[PDB]
Design a protein around this ligand. Structure first.
Ligand SMILES: CCCCCCCCCCCCCCCCCC(=O)OC[C@H](COP(=O)([O-])OCC(O)COP(=O)([O-])OC[C@@H](COC(=O)CCCCCCCCCCCCCCCCC)OC(=O)CCCCCCCCCCCCCCCCC)OC(=O)CCCCCCCCCCCCCCCCC
Ligand SMILES: CCCCCCCCCCC(CCCCCCCCCC)(CO[C@H]1O[C@@H](CO)[C@H](O[C@@H]2O[C@@H](CO)[C@H](O)[C@@H](O)[C@@H]2O)[C@@H](O)[C@@H]1O)CO[C@H]1O[C@@H](CO)[C@H](O[C@@H]2O[C@@H](CO)[C@H](O)[C@@H](O)[C@@H]2O)[C@@H](O)[C@H]1O
Ligand SMILES: CCCCCCCCCCC(CCCCCCCCCC)(CO[C@H]1O[C@@H](CO)[C@H](O[C@@H]2O[C@@H](CO)[C@H](O)[C@@H](O)[C@@H]2O)[C@@H](O)[C@@H]1O)CO[C@H]1O[C@@H](CO)[C@H](O[C@@H]2O[C@@H](CO)[C@H](O)[C@@H](O)[C@@H]2O)[C@@H](O)[C@H]1O
Ligand SMILES: CCCCC/C=C/C/C=C/C/C=C\C/C=C\CCCC(=O)O[C@H](COC(=O)CCCCCCCCCCCCCCCCC)COP(=O)(O)O[C@@H]1[C@H](O)[C@H](O)[C@@H](O)[C@H](O)[C@H]1O
Ligand SMILES: CCCCC/C=C/C/C=C/C/C=C\C/C=C\CCCC(=O)O[C@H](COC(=O)CCCCCCCCCCCCCCCCC)COP(=O)(O)O[C@@H]1[C@H](O)[C@H](O)[C@@H](O)[C@H](O)[C@H]1O
Ligand SMILES: CCCCC/C=C/C/C=C/CCCCCCCC(=O)O[C@H](COC(=O)CCCCCCCCCCCCCCC)COP(=O)(O)OCC[N+](C)(C)C
Ligand SMILES: CCCCCCCCCCCCCCCCCC(=O)OC[C@H](COP(=O)(O)OCCN)OC(=O)CCCCCCCCCCCCCCCCC
Ligand SMILES: CCCCCCCCCCCCCCCCCC(=O)OC[C@H](COP(=O)(O)OCCN)OC(=O)CCCCCCCCCCCCCCCCC
Ligand SMILES: CCCCCCCCCCCCCCCCCC(=O)OC[C@H](COP(=O)(O)OCCN)OC(=O)CCCCCCCCCCCCCCCCC
Ligand SMILES: CCCCCCCCCCCCCCCCCC(=O)OC[C@H](COP(=O)(O)OCCN)OC(=O)CCCCCCCCCCCCCCCCC
Lengths: 469, 81, 90, 89, 179, 485
């Protein structure tokens, strides 16, 4: 039903004028909502971890992958709401948050390529979907082409994605040269003992993982996330992370690997101490993604890691989404708007935010303490269920490095708080125009999920127990 | 005790020494890619270094695991200092 | 051309209430002395007197009363004893 | 396997130590894809099957589409800066 | 039991791997730099990198194998002593005595915490809780690690804890009874 | 019925906010209602039963919003024994006093402050109800963001660094607590304050588990290696933050060492009590000694609280019924007498002059005779001067620590001297001398301050004249944690 939307949409968008783009996005927003509501009853297919393979062992559909596609649709509904709804009706926010004509095309093609990775069984489906989503991130980065930083970022992302796609292709054909096969269903518990597939499968996982931003090769992605505009970067930070990690968690080819443990330790180290003395909010905000991708590289070492993974995925997705939406909302209160594409840059620009819209700071504080892992909030149970899998399986040094990394990362999370609860000289009293009803309801929904989502933990564990076991 | 132990050396193991350690380690890992005018040559040489270095490390590391611990300690030393 | 909105009406912050008259004459010397003592740790440096104090109170005294505490755990019972009776065990 | 391995390795190192212009980086990328093709088609011939030939005919098309995408990306890089630097982007 | 280490040859092997790692890192710093740089500035403007690699390698493996041969058992204390020696070598580039002592004790504590958890980045397979006997014993046996019982043997309590404080081989009640 | 009570009550709250700008009257009213409710619970409490009397389960799967009547239980349990209810009574009579303590000094944004203070009090109230390890741990760290916001927005010059330290040190010890809680929950597959003495772990698994819980207790009852956030988080807090902290958080970790460690780490605990005695004697002596050179005034009472908690820890770790009882009496009597001292330094002395340095204050008797009366009565009550409850706790804890090891009992008995040196050295400086040339004369102590002081002095004197009045709650729990075979 994504295919229908793309086929319908480029037909419809070629005939619309540029006056209609925003309304088109609104249409697609509601469309995706009724794909969630009217079509999710397909969860009844996946009782007792019943798994299907579709198109001749080409795609694999289990309940894990069903949850991942539900998550990707929910996030796309949020992001498309951010493009298709005005913040305010000023002549300001029209020249700032403006969609291009072909933006929603590339959005849906990227969601397609991201779904065909998690739903994938063979290696050429994996390859074709990786390049579909990679070309889509190239073009989503380059679509605001009236910008020096976004043009330079799209060129950098092209070359660094090209290398790490040729590394995946080399690993796939290298696997083919020793086994006349494409499946990891070929492996079946005995071949791994009598065959050295270590170097192959680890080079595959590494070429997949360096696109996330794991630690030796992290800086180019931090530069792409700082150079892209503020609406593009909330999408290109999230979607390759959850698609490629949901592939590599479903396929357990790096269990108890020494290289993945080295790079996970290094990722937790360099993300925690890397974003400490940093003064730009998207930089600060991208090293958070580096650490929280480290916590997934940990689960790659694991066998049977599907609870800790899926919980911490929807945790990180809601928290990520909310902390970018809060700093979208803080643009109304800053004394200095530069850089039309990226209107707030420096984290000291949100300095007096408690005296102008204090409940935005309540929002901010909730999602930042959930990033730290404070127990009434939803990020704590994510870190807790990761620890319950790390300690169950013998990773004892990894556990202490996780704890030290979370303690070090708490500093630059609280630096956002430390800036926003401060005195400011000229505070707001009376403002004529309002923030979007439709779009502030989304931020409040995302907060109420984070604070009051610990209620449903036992319900979620029981529904987990039936559909995955 | 009140100056040399409690405010002196229990803060060097506490909040006053950790601030300086993290200041230095963060400065070093941020200046890790300060050098070149080029973004692209910098990062594409950086990709070469790691897929060389990791391979060299596991070449060391299946021979003997004791002789690769100080290699990684030295890599942390040159990375964070 | 990017100026925050015309419809802001922003104005100055006040704490509000009553200005209590000054009950205390500040002393510049006492304030400088106390600000110097409160933040003593950011100007603290390792010397020989510092090293003497650090080794004597952080390693030497813990090792001493550690030796005493581990040597004397199940030594003494004094609960009901008489003349000519041991009060230690080993 | 020798010809594909060495064109991939020499192509990779020519990409990495490129400091002179930008289009050497593009053509080193394309020659990397050529070397991957060489290795795979040799394995398909040696194993007597089409499935390496299937992945090779698909990666031909994907290499073409990436060249089209990325060269339009270079054109948009060039729109605002009427020069391309020698040291790089 | 254990068998004594080759301090000679493991230290030679470590000096070899440190020399190679210094070669590779000096070449990497040469290639990733600015300014007039040629082929033999690799060892003049290196920043003293081969000294770091070889000195740490010789120091750690010499002190590790020597401490394991002097103590005649293998645990994480040897990693503590070897990390103290590595911190000494890394702290001597700092020409300052208190920073030298700080490098020694803190690197030794970090390496001892490393070597106490198993001295492995990755996992041990059979030592894991997933791949071990767990839960209750189902009937009475030597209670392993990761296992729970309801009652412990009192002889194990006397042998493990002691016969001192409040702890005795027979309870206070039946030691004082009327017949 | 019970939902209609709440949306009546939410409408009550909304209407009194609409007609009255402040909240503080309703927060006082809800606090005193909570008092009366806990004392009605104490009337219906069965002292003849060791079991947990008023049990309830939250967030069960069969009923996520509300109580649970089920065959299967995977939510969060709550319930009390006498040991829990002792600290609940101490908590609930302090919550209205901290809401009353800032009745006039917080001017700018009052409703935020009183909401934060009442919220912290409610979280610490529910800490003593909890019955799982994860249910204890969730409420055990719900306090920390509220403390961060409270210390950061309100305070002195340096309230940024104090708010950071109260998040940092507490979070850093309590993460290792979470490590040991995770290991317990994956070995036992149960976290429960009911069954957990029945399970026996291996000795070297116990000695691994015990370390992470003891490191968090060392951070939170601050023993000597990390005792260090405490003077700065006191010396730079607002008044109710200081009072709630030193009256309740330190005693909460004193409660956690009984509730979490002594039942299923017995065979570990016997191996480790000499190390606890090293650390607790070494945090009595060295902290009691480091108070003698202090220029600031709230920092002295912070270091005093360190030394008294160091006395209480060798009472709980004494393997004696006397030591357990004396540590409970010390915790309750300290939670009375120390917030009165923080009121003396932070309320009657910082509201009037807004400086906290010792060198300005001299000769306070001649303009403030009854403040000086309070200062000397509280100084002697803090020392270990008998008929006070502080001496009952200190005497029984020193006696238990003498039973478990007589030599560390002999060197721990000098805390009677060391605790009096700095306290009387401060008190005679404050009361004695010609009146200060820096201080201009202000009002004497007011009716609400005298009210808080009189309550916190009577409640030490009643425990000090008769410590038997709360033995009826504790006589089970004084026998419960003893491991003498
Ligand atoms: C409770 C928490 C306990 C944790 C406390 C730890 C924090 C201590 C902070 C010390 C400090 O001040 O350093 C500042 C210092 C900042 O530098 P600075 O600007 O030059 O000067 C600061 C002062 O002005 C200089 O003033 P100073 O010279 O007078 O201070 C003396 C000394 C004092 O430091 C002390 O703490 C001494 C305490 C001794 C008392 C012992 C009592 C025991 C009871 O501090 C130092 O100067 C240097 C200490 C060496 C730092 C070691 C960092 C690596 C250790 C491993 C950490 C992981 O830190 C560094 O430069 C260290 C380098 C940056 C990090 C590089 C990491 C390299 C990793 C090496 C390998 C690690 C192996 C890991 C094992 C893995 C196995 C595979
Ligand atoms: C074996 C250990 C040997 C102990 C030696 C003391 C030691 C280490 C202390 C470590 C403590 C370990 C604690 C335990 C573990 C905790 C980690 C510090 O030596 C300190 O000793 C002090 C007291 O003697 C001096 O203070 C004095 O106070 C006043 C008078 O009281 C005086 O008026 C005032 O002039 C002094 O400033 C300091 O100046 C001196 O730095 C090492 O001393 C040696 O190394 C260096 C510093 O590595 C020292 O200073 C350096 O050289 C200076 C030119 O000499 C340069 O200026 C500069 O390059 C640097 O300053 C040397 O001097 C040398 O002595
Ligand atoms: C801030 C606080 C820091 C706290 C860190 C504490 C970490 C201490 C780890 C202790 C622990 C993991 C337990 C962790 C559980 C939860 C941990 C919570 C998170 C911790 C993060 C790792 O034990 C490690 O201890 C090291 C030394 O202590 C060893 O080092 C190395 O030494 C030399 C190797 O031969 C090398 O030659 C040298 O190179 C190395 O150096 C390791 O080999 C060993 O694996 C113990 O696990 C293990 O214990 C053993 C013996 O009972 C269990 O034995 C089995 O069971 C019984 C019948 O079946 C029998 O009796 C027993 O005979 C049988 O074999 C195992 O089942 C296993 O489970
Ligand atoms: C870019 C564009 C494309 C460019 C192409 C040009 C280059 C092509 C080569 C391709 C390489 C691509 C690079 C790949 C990255 C490096 C990959 C890599 O190190 O994985 C290592 C290689 O495991 C070898 O067995 C170790 C392998 C040793 C290799 C020796 C090398 C010798 C060189 C001598 C000079 C994986 O071990 P691992 O971590 O699972 O570790 C194992 C562990 O050792 C075992 O004990 C266990 O059984 C197992 O559970 C696990 O723990
Ligand atoms: C189970 C898994 C968990 C799921 C958690 C669910 C999260 C999101 C669920 C959303 C479902 C939303 C239900 C809300 C429907 C009710 C609702 O508040 O109306 C919207 C928000 O409407 C969305 O924003 C609609 C947002 C739609 C998003 C759908 C996502 C699916 C807020 O209007 P509002 O009153 O402030 O404001 C309007 C408007 O401002 C004035 O012009 C008009 O005078 C008048 O109409 C006034 O009412
Ligand atoms: C008409 C409804 C239309 C469908 C709506 C679907 C939206 C997709 C949204 C995704 C992000 C929002 C979080 C929602 C979590 C849903 C939990 C769940 O149910 O996921 C299950 C467990 O998840 C797991 O293991 C682990 C999941 C971890 C969840 C952790 C977050 C907890 C707090 C937020 C969720 C509770 C909010 C409930 C508020 C009333 C696994 O998949 P299922 O086959 O059983 O799904 C069936 C859901 N159906 C029936 C509505 C289709
Ligand atoms: C027998 C066979 C013998 C083989 C010989 C042993 C070879 C071991 C491999 C040597 C690795 C060398 C590391 C290196 O390349 O040097 C660091 C490189 C240059 O750094 P630099 O230019 O000095 O940065 C300035 C900072 N101010 O800086 C870099 O950018 C390199 C990026 C990291 C390289 C990969 C690191 C892999 C190890 C992960 C860290 C381990 C963490 C463990 C905890
Ligand atoms: C990532 C970032 C990491 C940063 C690290 C910062 C420093 C961390 C704190 C320092 C921890 C140092 C731990 C050293 C432990 C060395 C060790 O392996 O201890 C093993 C020991 C059992 O050894 P055993 O063989 O039974 O007896 C030998 C008697 N000679 O076991 C014991 O005897 C118990 C030792 C307890 C030590 C407690 C230390 C405080 C916790
Ligand atoms: C998460 C968000 C959940 C919010 C639940 C709020 C429930 C409030 C219900 C009580 C009530 O009726 O309050 C209504 C009141 C009216 O709003 P008001 O701003 O006063 O309107 C003024 C118009 N001139 O509204 C209010 O009184 C404002 C209530 C705001 C609550 C802010 C809480 C900040 C954090 C407090 C400490 C944390 C509490 C959690 C830990 C315990
Ligand atoms: C800041 C971030 C941190 C904040 C975290 C705050 C945690 C808040 C958790 C809320 C806990 C709700 C528990 C309510 C229990 C009320 C109750 O017990 O009775 C009322 C009713 C259930 O009736 P009951 O008699 O218990 O049915 C079972 C009989 N065996 O149950 C009810 O109807 C109560 C319904 C409450 C709805 C509240 C929804 C959130 C509002 C905000």
């Amino acid at each position: 039903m994504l295919i229908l939307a793309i086929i319908s949409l480029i037909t419809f968008v070629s005939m619309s004028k540029l006056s209609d783009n925003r309304a088109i996005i609104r249409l697609i927003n509601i469309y995706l909502i009724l794909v969630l509501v009217l079509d999710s009853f397909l969860y009844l297919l996946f009782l007792n971890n019943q798994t299907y393979t579709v198109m001749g062992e080409l795609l694999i559909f289990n309940s894990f992958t069903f949850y991942i596609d539900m998550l990707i649709y929910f996030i796309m509904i949020v992001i498309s709401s951010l493009y298709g709804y005005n913040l305010y009706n000023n002549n300001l926010y029209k020249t700032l948050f403006e969609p291009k004509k072909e933006l929603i095309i590339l959005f849906l093609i990227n969601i397609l390529g991201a779904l065909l990775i998690v739903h994938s069984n063979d290696f050429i489906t994996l390859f074709v979907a990786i390049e579909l989503q990679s070309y889509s991130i190239y073009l989503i980065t380059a679509i605001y082409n009236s910008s020096y930083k976004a043009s330079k970022a799209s060129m950098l992302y092209f070359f660094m994605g090209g290398i790490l796609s040729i590394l995946i292709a080399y690993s796939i054909n290298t696997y083919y040269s020793v086994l006349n096969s494409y499946t990891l269903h070929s492996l079946d518990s005995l071949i791994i003992n009598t065959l050295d597939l270590n170097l192959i499968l680890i080079a595959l996982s590494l070429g997949l993982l360096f696109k996330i931003g794991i630690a030796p090769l992290h800086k180019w992605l931090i530069s792409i996330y700082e150079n892209t505009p503020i609406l593009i970067t909330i999408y290109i930070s999230l979607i390759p992370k959850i698609s490629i990690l949901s592939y590599l968690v479903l396929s357990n080819i790096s269990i108890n690997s020494l290289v993945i443990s080295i790079l996970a330790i290094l990722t937790l180290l360099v993300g925690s101490v890397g974003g400490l003395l940093q003064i730009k909010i998207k930089r600060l905000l991208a090293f958070s993604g580096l650490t929280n991708a480290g916590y997934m590289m940990l689960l790659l070492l694991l066998n049977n890691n599907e609870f800790s993974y899926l919980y911490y995925i929807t945790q990180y997705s809601i928290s990520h989404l909310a902390i970018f939406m809060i700093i979208i909302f803080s643009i109304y209160y800053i004394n200095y708007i530069n850089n039309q594409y990226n209107p707030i840059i420096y984290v000291n620009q949100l300095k007096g935010l408690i005296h102008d819209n204090a409940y935005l700071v309540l929002s901010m504080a909730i999602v930042v303490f959930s990033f730290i892992g404070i127990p009434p909030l939803l990020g704590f149970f994510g870190k807790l269920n990761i620890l319950m899998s790390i300690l169950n399986n013998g990773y004892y040094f990894i556990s202490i490095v996780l704890i030290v990394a979370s303690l070090i990362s708490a500093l630059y999370y609280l630096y956002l708080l430390n800036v926003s609860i401060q005195d400011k000289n000229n505070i707001l009293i009376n403002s004529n125009e309002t923030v979007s009803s439709v779009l502030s309801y989304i931020l409040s929904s995302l907060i109420i999920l984070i604070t009051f989502g610990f209620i449903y933990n036992s319900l979620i564990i029981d529904i987990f127990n039936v559909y995955f076991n | 005790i009140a100056h040399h132990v409690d405010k002196g050396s229990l803060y060097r193991l506490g909040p006053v020494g950790i601030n300086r350690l993290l200041n230095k380690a963060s400065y070093n890992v941020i200046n890790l890619s300060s050098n070149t005018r080029s973004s692209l040559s910098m990062n594409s040489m950086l990709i070469l270094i790691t897929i060389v270095s990791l391979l060299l490390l596991v070449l060391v590391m299946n021979v003997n695991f004791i002789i690769v611990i100080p290699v990684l300690i030295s890599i942390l030393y040159i990375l964070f200092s | 051309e990017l100026k925050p909105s015309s419809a802001i009406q922003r104005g100055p912050l006040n704490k509000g209430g009553w200005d209590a008259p000054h009950a205390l004459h500040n002393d510049g010397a006492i304030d400088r002395y106390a600000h110097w003592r409160t933040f003593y740790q950011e100007r603290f440096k390792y010397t020989r007197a510092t090293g003497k104090s650090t080794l004597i109170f952080l390693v030497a005294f813990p090792a001493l009363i550690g030796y005493v505490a581990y040597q004397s755990e199940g030594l003494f019972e004094f609960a009901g004893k008489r003349r000519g009776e041991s009060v230690t065990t080993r | 396997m020798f010809i594909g391995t060495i064109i991939l390795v020499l192509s990779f190192l020519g990409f990495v130590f490129n400091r002179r212009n930008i289009i050497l980086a593009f053509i080193c990328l394309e020659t990397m894809l050529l070397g991957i093709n060489l290795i795979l088609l040799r394995n398909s011939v040696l194993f007597d099957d089409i499935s390496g030939s299937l992945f090779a005919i698909v990666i031909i098309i994907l290499a073409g589409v990436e060249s089209a995408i990325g060269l339009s990306l270079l054109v948009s890089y060039y729109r605002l800066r009427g020069v391309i630097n020698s040291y790089g982007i | 039991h254990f068998h004594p280490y080759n301090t000679l040859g493991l230290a030679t092997q470590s000096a070899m791997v440190g020399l190679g790692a210094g070669v590779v890192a000096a070449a990497a710093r040469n290639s990733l730099a600015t300014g007039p740089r040629n082929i033999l500035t690799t060892f003049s403007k290196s920043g003293g990198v081969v000294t770091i690699f070889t000195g740490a390698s010789i120091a750690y493996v010499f002190t590790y194998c020597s401490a394991a041969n002097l103590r005649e058992r293998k645990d994480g204390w040897n990693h503590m002593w070897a990390g103290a020696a590595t911190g000494a070598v890394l702290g001597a580039r700092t020409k300052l005595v208190p920073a030298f002592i700080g490098w020694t004790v803190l690197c030794g504590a970090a390496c001892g915490l490393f070597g106490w958890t198993g001295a492995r980045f990755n996992a041990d397979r059979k030592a894991s809780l997933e791949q071990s006997p767990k839960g209750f014993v189902q009937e009475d046996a030597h209670q392993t690690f990761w296992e729970v019982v309801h009652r412990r043997p009192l002889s194990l309590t006397v042998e493990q804890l002691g016969e001192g404080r409040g702890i005795n081989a027979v309870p206070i009640a039946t030691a004082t009874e009327a017949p | 019925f019970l939902t209609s009570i709440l949306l009546s009550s939410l409408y009550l709250f909304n209407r009194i906010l609409a007609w009255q700008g402040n909240v503080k009257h309703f927060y006082l009213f809800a606090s005193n209602l909570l008092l009366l409710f806990i004392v009605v619970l104490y009337i219906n409490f069965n002292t003849f039963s060791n079991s947990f009397q008023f049990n309830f389960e939250l967030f069960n799967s069969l009923n996520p919003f509300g109580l649970s009547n089920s065959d299967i239980s995977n939510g969060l349990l709550f319930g009390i024994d006498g040991l829990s209810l002792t600290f609940i009574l101490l908590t609930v009579l302090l919550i209205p006093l901290t809401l009353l303590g800032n009745w006039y000094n917080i001017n700018f944004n009052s409703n935020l402050y009183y909401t934060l203070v009442l919220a912290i009090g409610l979280v610490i109230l529910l800490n003593f109800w909890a019955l799982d390890y994860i249910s204890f741990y969730i409420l055990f760290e719900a306090t920390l963001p509220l403390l961060f916001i409270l210390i950061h927005i309100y305070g002195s010059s340096d309230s940024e660094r104090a708010s950071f330290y109260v998040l940092m040190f507490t979070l850093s010890g309590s993460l290792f607590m979470l490590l040991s809680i995770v290991v317990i929950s994956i070995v036992l597959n149960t976290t429960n304050f009911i069954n957990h003495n029945l399970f026996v772990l291996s000795l070297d698994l116990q000695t691994i588990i015990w370390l992470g819980l003891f490191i968090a207790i060392m951070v939170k009852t601050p023993l000597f290696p990390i005792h260090v956030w405490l003077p700065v988080v006191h010396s730079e807090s607002p008044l109710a933050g200081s009072m709630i902290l030193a009256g309740l958080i330190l005693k909460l970790a004193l409660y956690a060492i009984l509730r979490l460690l002594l039942p299923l780490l017995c065979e570990a605990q016997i191996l480790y009590t000499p190390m606890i005695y090293i650390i607790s004697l070494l945090t009595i002596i060295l902290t009691s000694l480091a108070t003698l050179r202090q220029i600031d005034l709230k920092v002295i009472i912070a270091y005093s609280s360190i030394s008294h908690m160091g006395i209480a820890i060798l009472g709980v770790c004494s393997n004696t019924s006397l030591g357990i009882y004396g540590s409970i009496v010390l915790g309750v009597a300290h939670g009375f007498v120390s917030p009165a001292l923080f009121l003396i330094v932070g309320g009657i002395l910082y509201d009037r002059y807004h400086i906290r340095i010792v060198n300005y204050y001299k000769g306070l008797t001649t303009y403030m005779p009854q403040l000086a009366t309070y200062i000397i009565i509280l100084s002697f009550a803090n020392i270990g001067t008998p008929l006070t409850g502080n001496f009952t706790g200190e005497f029984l804890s020193l006696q238990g620590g003498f039973i478990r090891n007589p030599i560390i009992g002999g060197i721990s008995c000098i805390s009677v001297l060391l605790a009096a040196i700095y306290q009387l050295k401060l008190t005679n400086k404050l009361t004695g001398g010609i009146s200060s040339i820096y201080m201009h004369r202000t009002n004497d102590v007011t009716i609400r301050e005298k009210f808080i002081m009189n309550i916190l002095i009577i409640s030490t004197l009643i425990i000090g004249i008769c410590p038997q009045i709360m033995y009826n709650l504790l006589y089970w729990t004084v026998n419960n944690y003893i491991y003498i075979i």
